[PDB]
């Protein structure tokens with residue numbers, strides 16, 4: 096286990112399937128470090144709940160909440176935090192319409208060093224209760240000695256890249272965290288940062304964010320193999336944006352083209368999209384309320400029925416999580432027999448142009464609406480040509496440094512003819528869920 100990729104704990108599965116999963120209380124535990132201060136980047140917050148997840152002895156250490164809320168939503172979040180004098184707030188600018196601050200990250204400053212946590216869960220009870228969520232834990236980064244001049248940089252450029260991500264906010268509270276990061280040694284980091292920030296990127300900046308950032312990393316740090324056209328692409332997400340009237344508008348033109356990049360040189364490639372069916376949701380641990388966090392609207396869906404022929408059911412027997420609906424998002428490049436993968440990405444980014452970017456101005460400008468963040472696992476960053484897929488997520492492989500814990504089942508299973516994608520704002524009243532209820536929005 097050099098990967099430090101974890102799932103959140105799920106209430107209701109056997110201990111087997113929570114051994115080696117992490118609750119937020121585990122992440123914040125004193126065993127991970129003696130907390131001095133922390134920043135919580137997220138979308139949705141329950142501040143009363145969040146403070147209770149810190150150890151009692153750490154609950155009055157400074158906390159910065161980085162959010163995107165405006166107007167009345169912003170006022171609600173300030174009211175939530177008002178009782179806690181140690182909580183500050185940073186409103187991330189969202190200067191492009193319909194953008195959101197979706198990045199989920201913890202910056203944890205300790206007496207002993209610094210830790211970075213990039214994950215997929217909102218800071219609310221339900222996101223850590225019975226959902227499948229993903230976590231990347233950085234190593235404990237030591238502080239660089241005062242007077243020592245060294246970069247603290249990793250072979251993946253993670254330190255400069257994380258600072259660049261923070262600089263995009265142009266925010267005084269985050270300049271303080273940038274200076275903290277400058278003072279620490281991040282050289283052990285073996286993942287690449289893939290962020291989105293709002294803007295319109297041309298020229299050099301084109302490769303900094305979103306799907307062009309992914310394409311650049313795959314061009315530069317992966318190698319193309321023979322029969323690469325046979326290696327599928329897998330995207331796994333919990334919501335879908337408006338992608339256009341057919342697959343040529345965005346999904347299999349620019350988005351798939353970035354995903355299928357390997358190496359420097361120059362489509363038959365199968366595209367598998369994993370998104371919960373109605374039946375997945377109905378029979379889940381949560382029942383239909385799980386669909387409250389799968390926000391695919393009928394208005395969007397009915398304009399792109401072509402897309403649903405790509406959809407595969409959620410299935411996660413390998414991690415005992417078939418009934419724990421996904422709020423994790425992942426993208427990866429498996430071999431034709433799904434025994435190996437060329438790379439793996441865990442991210443906040445759903446399958447949307449807002450999250451990944453859409454080309455504008457005759458292909459010269461990448462427009463991104465939202466903040467997103469993920470980390471990319473490349474075999475080259477581990478001295479490998481590919482990763483073997485771990486057969487059981489929580490089991491003991493024969494070579495863990497070469498065996499990546501994919502958290503759901505392969506090959507993905509196509510929707511049946513009676514299945515439908517979960518669409519959250521129409522009623523389901525033909526069969527009740529695991530709690531005995533229908534869904535009437």
Ligand SMILES: *S(=O)(=O)Oc1ccccc1-c1cccc2c(=O)c(C(=O)O)c[nH]c12
Nearest residue numbers: 138139196197215216217387388389390443
């Ligand atoms: S937000 O304003 O709280 O909610 C919105 C707003 C517009 C579209 C979708 C959503 C939404 C609904 C349910 C769950 C969501 C979620 O889990 C995220 C996330 O980034 O984690 C984002 N939006 C969600």
